[PDB]
Amino acid sequence: MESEFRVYSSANNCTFEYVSQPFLNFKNLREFVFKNIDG
Amino acid sequence: ASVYAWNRKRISNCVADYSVLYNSASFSTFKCYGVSPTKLNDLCFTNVYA
Ligand SMILES: *[C@@H]1O[C@H](CO)[C@@H](O)[C@H](O)[C@H]1NC(C)=O
Hints:
This is part of a larger assembly, with 2 copies of chain A.
Chain A: no helix or strand
The complex binds 2-acetamido-2-deoxy-beta-D-glucopyranose (NAG).
């Protein structure tokens, strides 16, 4: 059971929020590419 | 809200249909400064402060 969130202490000025569908021996291989091009 | 404590709603990441507001008969003042109502339905903006 997930009952511990300790990643931040505050959130002051939000510009953008987006809630989406979930993306997700070792059995799974997850490849991701993150790019910042022209904003 | 009261004018001293005016509510501010930030509007982002959606489709803004301004013709529903402009063609309503329920508004007495619809004075736009810096832009015309006819091209509001064409232009695109980063954020809307209400
Ligand atoms: C960002 O937040 C601080 C305090 O939370 C505030 O003083 C400042 O005006 C805010 N700036 C914008 C652009 O919202």
